[PDB]
Amino acid sequence: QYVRIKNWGSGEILHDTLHHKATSDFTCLGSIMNPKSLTRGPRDKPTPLEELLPHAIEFINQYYGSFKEAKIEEHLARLEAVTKEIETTGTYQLTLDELIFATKMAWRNAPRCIGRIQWSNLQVFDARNCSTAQEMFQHICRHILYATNNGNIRSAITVFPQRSDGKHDFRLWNSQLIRYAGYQMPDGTIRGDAATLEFTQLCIDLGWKPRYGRFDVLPLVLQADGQDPEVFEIPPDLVLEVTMEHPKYEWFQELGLKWYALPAVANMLLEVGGLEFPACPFNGWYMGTEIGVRDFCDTQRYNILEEVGRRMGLETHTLASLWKDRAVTEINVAVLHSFQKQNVTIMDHHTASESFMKHMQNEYRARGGCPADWIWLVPPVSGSITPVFHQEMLNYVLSPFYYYQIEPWKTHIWQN
Amino acid sequence: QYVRIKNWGSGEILHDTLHHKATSDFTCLGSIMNPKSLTRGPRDKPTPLEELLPHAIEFINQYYGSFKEAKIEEHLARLEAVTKEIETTGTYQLTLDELIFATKMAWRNAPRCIGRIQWSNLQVFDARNCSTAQEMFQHICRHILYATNNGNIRSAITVFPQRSDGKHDFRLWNSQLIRYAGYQMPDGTIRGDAATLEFTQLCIDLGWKPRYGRFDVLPLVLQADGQDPEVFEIPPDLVLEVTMEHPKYEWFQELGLKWYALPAVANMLLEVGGLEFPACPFNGWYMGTEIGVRDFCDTQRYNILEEVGRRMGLETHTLASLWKDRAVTEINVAVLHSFQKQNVTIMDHHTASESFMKHMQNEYRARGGCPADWIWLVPPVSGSITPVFHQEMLNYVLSPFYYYQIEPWKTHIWQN
Ligand code: HEM
Numbered sequence: 121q122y123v124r125i126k127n128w129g130s131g132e133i134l135h136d137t138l139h140h141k142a143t144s145d146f147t148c149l150g151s152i153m154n155p156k157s158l159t160r161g162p163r164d165k166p167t168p169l170e171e172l173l174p175h176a177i178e179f180i181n182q183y184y185g186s187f188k189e190a191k192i193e194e195h196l197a198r199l200e201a202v203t204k205e206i207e208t209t210g211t212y213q214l215t216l217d218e219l220i221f222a223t224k225m226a227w228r229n230a231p232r233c234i235g236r237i238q239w240s241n242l243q244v245f246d247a248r249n250c251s252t253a254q255e256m257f258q259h260i261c262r263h264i265l266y267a268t269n270n271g272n273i274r275s276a277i278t279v280f281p282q283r284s285d286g287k288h289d290f291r292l293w294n295s296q297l298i299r300y301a302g303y304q305m306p307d308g309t310i311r312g313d314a315a316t317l318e319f320t321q322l323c324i325d326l327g328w329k330p331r332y333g334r335f336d337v338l339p340l341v342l343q344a345d346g347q348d349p350e351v352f353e354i355p356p357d358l359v360l361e362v363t364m365e366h367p368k369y370e371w372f373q374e375l376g377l378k379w380y381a382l383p384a385v386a387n388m389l390l391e392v393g394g395l396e397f398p399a400c401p402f403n404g405w406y407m408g409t410e411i412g413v414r415d416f417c418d419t420q421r422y423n424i425l426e427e428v429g430r431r432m433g434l435e436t437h438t439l440a441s442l443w444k445d446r447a448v449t450e451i452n453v454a455v456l457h458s459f460q461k462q463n464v465t466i467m468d469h470h471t472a473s474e475s476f477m478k479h480m481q482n483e484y485r486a487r488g489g490c491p492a493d494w495i496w497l498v499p500p501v502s503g504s505i506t507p508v509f510h511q512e513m514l515n516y517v518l519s520p521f522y523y524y525q526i527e528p529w530k531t532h533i534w535q536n
Numbered sequence: 537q538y539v540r541i542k543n544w545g546s547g548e549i550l551h552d553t554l555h556h557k558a559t560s561d562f563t564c565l566g567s568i569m570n571p572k573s574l575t576r577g578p579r580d581k582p583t584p585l586e587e588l589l590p591h592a593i594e595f596i597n598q599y600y601g602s603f604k605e606a607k608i609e610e611h612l613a614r615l616e617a618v619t620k621e622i623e624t625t626g627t628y629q630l631t632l633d634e635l636i637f638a639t640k641m642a643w644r645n646a647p648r649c650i651g652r653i654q655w656s657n658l659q660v661f662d663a664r665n666c667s668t669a670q671e672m673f674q675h676i677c678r679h680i681l682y683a684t685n686n687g688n689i690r691s692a693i694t695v696f697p698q699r700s701d702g703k704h705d706f707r708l709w710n711s712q713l714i715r716y717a718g719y720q721m722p723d724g725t726i727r728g729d730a731a732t733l734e735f736t737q738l739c740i741d742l743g744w745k746p747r748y749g750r751f752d753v754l755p756l757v758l759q760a761d762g763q764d765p766e767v768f769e770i771p772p773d774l775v776l777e778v779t780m781e782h783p784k785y786e787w788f789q790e791l792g793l794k795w796y797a798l799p800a801v802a803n804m805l806l807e808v809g810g811l812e813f814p815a816c817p818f819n820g821w822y823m824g825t826e827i828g829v830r831d832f833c834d835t836q837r838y839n840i841l842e843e844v845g846r847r848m849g850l851e852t853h854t855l856a857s858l859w860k861d862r863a864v865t866e867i868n869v870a871v872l873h874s875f876q877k878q879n880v881t882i883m884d885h886h887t888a889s890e891s892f893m894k895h896m897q898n899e900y901r902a903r904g905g906c907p908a909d910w911i912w913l914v915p916p917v918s919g920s921i922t923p924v925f926h927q928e929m930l931n932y933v934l935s936p937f938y939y940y941q942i943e944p945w946k947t948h949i950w951q952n
Pocket residue numbers: 223227230232233234235236238242275276277385402403404405406407410467522
C-alpha cells in the first residue's frame with residue numbers, strides 16, 4: 121500500500137504512495153553516478169506507436185488532471201486530437217502550456233535536485249521551431265542573458281525541437297552552458313579546469329582558439345538537426361563572473377580566483393508523454409558548496425585546498441589537525457561573501473537543506489511522495505549538520521523526467 | 537560477468553565479481569536505516585535441516601578454502617563430521633578456529649564499517665558455554681576490561697551461545713555496552729542523552745536506580761537462555777572516560793563535557809554457516825566524528841552546537857554565516873585533542889577514510905570486491921574532502937554477516 125519513511129532527527133513518519141507510479145527497471149547500486157536507469161540513449165527509428173500513444177494519453181490525463189477546476193470537454197477533445205495527430209503524423213506536438221507544465225514537473229521529479237521548492241517558478245523559452253546551429257546559438261544567448269539578469273539570477277529552460285527519427289537530434293555537446301577550459305601545458309602542468317581537458321581539446325580540434333588562461337570560458341559546441349557540431353564563442357558581455365574575496369583574509373584575493381554566476385546544465389534530455397527532447401538546457405542559481413567545495417577543493421579540479429591551508433598557517437602536514445576542515449570552510453565563506461557583495465544570487469547549503477525539507481513535506485502532503493536521491497541531496501560538507509542527512513528517502517523515476525544521455529561524440533556519425 | 541565501478545577523483549576503474557556470492561533478497565531504498573534485508577528476526581522452531589546443511593557445507597568449504605596450503609584430508613573429514621553432527625543432533629558446533637574465522641569474515645563483510653582495514657586484528661572471547669545472566673555479566677566485564685586496556689583500545693568480540701530453537705536466545709537488550717542515560721526532568725527539560733529516554737525508563741522499571749546526571753552510564757540488561765532480562769550495573773572502575781578540552785578555548789572545559797572511550801555494538805546477530813548467534817557484542821575504537829558530530833551535535837542528542845557558536849562569538853542567528861561549520865569543526869578538534877592528550881585511541885575521519893580506500897583496494901585485489909554502503913561510509917562532515925565520497929561502491933549481503941535484530945522488548949514473552 122505504501123512505504124514507511126522515517127526522519128531520525130524528529131522521529132516524524134511519512135508514507136510514500138507516489139512510488140507506485142514509477143516507470144521501467146531501476147538499479148544495490150545507489151552510489152553509481154551514471155546508471156543506465158537514469159540514461160535515455162539515441163535511436164535510429166521513430167518511437168513505436170503502440171508505445172507512444174499510451175504514454176501520450178497518460179501525460180494528457182496528468183495535465184488536465186492538474187487543474188483545480190476540471191475542463192472535461194477540452195480534456196476529451198485533447199485526447200482525441202492527440203490520438204489523431206499520432207495516427208496521421210506518427211507523433212504529436214505539445215501545446216505551449218503542456219510543455220511549460222512538463223518542464224516544471226520534470227524538475228519537480230528530479231531526485232538529485234535540492235532546489236525543487238522553486239519548481240513552479242520557471243521561465244520557458246519555446247525554441248521547437250529552431251532549425252540551424254546559428255539559431256541555436258541565438259536562443260542560448262537569449263537564455264543566458266535572461267537568466268543572468270545582471271546578477272538577480274532567474275531560472276529558465278530553452279526547449280529545442282523534439283527527437284523525430286533519432287537521426288536529426290538537436291544536441292549541446294557541452295555539459296554546462298558556462299564552463300572553463302583546461303590545458304595540458306608544455307612544462308607538464310595543468311592550467312585551468314583539469315576536468316575539461318578532453319572537451320577543451322575537442323573545441324580546439326574544431327577550430328576554437330585556445331587562450332591558455334586559468335579561467336577561459338569554453339565555446340558552445342552545437343549540433344542541430346543531426347548535423348555535425350559547430351563552434352560558437354559565447355559573447356564575453358553575457359558572462360557574469362564573481363571575483364573571490366574573503367571578508368577577513370586580505371590575501372585571499374591574491375589567489376586570483378573567480379567563478380561564473382550562471383549554473384546551467386546543458387546536456388540532459390527531457391522525456392514527456394512519450395516524446396524526447398535531446399536539447400533542453402536549463403539553469404537555476406548556485407548553492408555555495410558547488411563552487412567552494414567541488415570546483416575549488418576537488419583534487420581533480422582547481423585543487424586549492426593545500427594552498428589555502430598554508431596561507432592560514434595550519435598544520436597541513438598533519439591530517440588529524442583537521443586543517444582541511446578549517447580551510448574548506450573559509451573557502452565556502454569567501455564564495456558566499458563574494459557573491460553577496462557583488463549582488464549575485466546564491467544560497468548557502470544550510471538554508472538550501474532546510475528549504476528542501478519544507479518542499480519534501482509539501483510534496484508528501486500534495487501527492488504522497490517526493491523522489492529523492494540522498495547521496496546527491498546531502499551537501500558535500502557538514503552532512504549531519506543539515507536536516508536532509510537524517511531524512512530517509514525513496515529514489516524512483518517518474519515521468520516527465522530529465523535523463524542523462526550518452527556522450528554525443530561517442531555516437532555521432534560525422535559527415536566529414 | 538562483473539560490475540564496473542569508478543572513482544571520480546582518480547578515474548581508476550574496478551571490476552566487482554564478489555557480488556555474485558550475495559544472498560537472499562536485498563532492498564531504490566538505499567537510505568533506509570533498518571531495512572528487513574539487514575535484519576535477522578526471532579524464531580520459535582529450529583532451523584530446517586534442508587536449509588542448515590547446505591549453508592554449513594558452504595561455510596566449511598570457505599573456511600578450508602582460506603588456507604594458503606590446503607588440508608584436503610581435514611577438509612573432507614570436517615565436512616563429514618559436520619553432516620553427521622547435524623543428522624544426529626539437529627545442528628552443529630563450530631570449532632574455535634572456525635568461529636574466529638567467522639567473526640573476522642563477518643566484520644570484513646560489514647558494508648557500513650569504515651574501519652575494516654583492521655579486520656584480521658580481532659580478539660575472540662568464546663562464551664558459548666555460558667548459561668546464566670550473571671555469567672554473561674562476568675564475560676562482558678572481562679571484555680570491557682580487555683578492550684579498554686587503559687586507553688590503548690583493542691578490538692574484541694564475545695560470542696555467546698548460538699540460537700537453538702529460538703526460545704532460549706541470549707540477548708543484550710542494550711544497543712551498546714557503554715551508553716549514557718536520558719531523563720525527562722520535572723521542569724520538562726531533558727537531561728543526559730535524549731535518545732535513550734525510553735531505554736532508561738525500562739532500566740528504572742527493572743529496578744535500576746536513576747541518578748539524574750548528564751552522563752550516567754546505563755546498566756546492562758541481560759537476557760540469558762530466553763529468560764527475563766536482568767539488570768547489572770557496570771563497575772565504574774571499568775568505564776574509561778575522556779574529559780573534553782579545547783587546545784585553545786579555555787572555556788571549552790567549562791561546558792563540562794566528557795564521553796566514554798569504548799565504542800561497542802551490543803545488540804547485533806552473527807550469522808555463519810547456517811548458525812545464528814543473537815548475542816555477540818563487539819568493539820573497535822572511535823572515529824572522532826561519532827562523538828564530535830553525532831553525539832554532541834545531533835539535535836536529538838546532546839545538541840551543543842548553538843552554545844559553542846555563542847562562546848565563539850559567531851553570528852548564530854544567520855545561517856549563511858556558516859557558523860555551524862565553524863563550530864562543529866572546533867568541537868571535532870576538542871574531541872581528538874582530548875583523546876590524544878589522555879592517551880586514548882581514536883582516529884580522525886580523514887585518516888579513517890584514506891584507511892578504508894586502501895582496504896577497498898586490497899579487497900578487490902584479494903577477492904574481487906568489497907561490500908560497501910556509501911551512505912554510512914562517508915563521514916558526517918567534510919564529505920567530498922574525503923576520498924570515499926568520490927568512490928562508487930556496491931552494497932550487498934554476504935555470509936558470514938552481522939545482522940540487526942528486532943528490538944527484544946517487542947518480541948519477548950515475559951515469565952512475570
Ligand atoms: C532555483 C535554484 C536551484 C538550485 C539552488 C538547485 C540546486 C541544485 C544542485 C546543488 C544540484 C547538484 C548539481 C551537481 O552536484 O552536479 C542540482 C542538480 C539538478 N538540478 Fe537543480 N537547482 C535549482 C534549479 C533547477 C532547475 C530550474 C532545474 C530544471 C528545470 C533543475 C534541475 C536539476 C537536475 C535535473 C539536476 C541533476 C543534474 C545531474 O544529475 O547532473 N534545478 N540542482
